[PDB]
Design a protein around this ligand. Structure first.
Ligand code: NA
Length: 210
């Protein structure tokens, strides 16, 4: 189609009731996916202490084209997607959970959105999990990236090769994240299909979600 659409405020919650929760996690689904889908990762990820928020994308897609299309071709849908993630973060903080106890988890299109949001808005977060994603745009626009991660643990993975996410863009993303003071774990899985492997799940559970 095109990028001339809005993500309306569709937010699905699960996990610990937010008023009781010590921590929260913002979970971002992939292209053609759903909030209910992505939440089911709580069955294998150590999220049992988190209030879970998963916004649902309009058209089940955050933005219409490859994350590496000229960024204007993904606008205004992308800005709308970033706005919605920001609304979710704002809601969590208003429920009394500070950003340093807020975690992010995304797969594929959702991992790209996760990285793009957190890097435009870098501060001390609980942790950031980007399963097969990179920062967004044909050209990286460094001028959009502001803040300091204050050693936020970040896990970023991809497969090699992967026709959706070149290894080069994951490397570039790592370089930018490290420059902004994230504590970055990058893992590239040669020959892995476009998926979340069991190894990634265990690794995230023993590190970011320790
Ligand atoms: Na943790």
């Amino acid at each position: 189609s095109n990028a001339m659409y809005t993500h309306s405020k569709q937010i699905i919650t699960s996990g610990v009731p937010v008023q009781r929760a010590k921590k929260a996690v913002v979970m971002l689904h992939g292209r053609g996916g759903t909030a209910a889908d992505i939440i089911s990762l709580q069955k294998v990820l150590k999220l049992d202490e988190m209030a879970i928020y998963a916004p649902q994308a309009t058209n089940n897609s955050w933005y219409p084209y490859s994350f590496m299309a000229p960024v204007q071709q993904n606008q205004p849908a992308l800005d709308s997607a970033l706005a919605l993630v920001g609304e979710v973060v704002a809601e969590i903080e208003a429920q009394g959970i500070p950003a340093e106890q807020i975690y992010f988890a995304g797969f594929s299109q959702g991992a790209c959105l996760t990285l793009e949001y957190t890097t435009r808005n870098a501060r001390k977060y609980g942790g950031i999990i980007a399963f097969t994603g990179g920062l967004i745009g044909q050209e990286l626009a460094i001028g959009n990236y502001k803040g300091d991660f204050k050693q936020t643990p970040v896990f970023i993975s991809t497969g090699n090769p992967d026709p959706h996410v070149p290894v080069s863009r994951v490397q570039e993303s790592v370089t930018i994240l490290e420059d902004m003071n994230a504590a970055v774990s990058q893992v590239v899985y040669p020959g892995r299909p476009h998926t979340i492997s069991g190894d990634e799940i265990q690794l995230v559970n023993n590190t970011i979600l320790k």
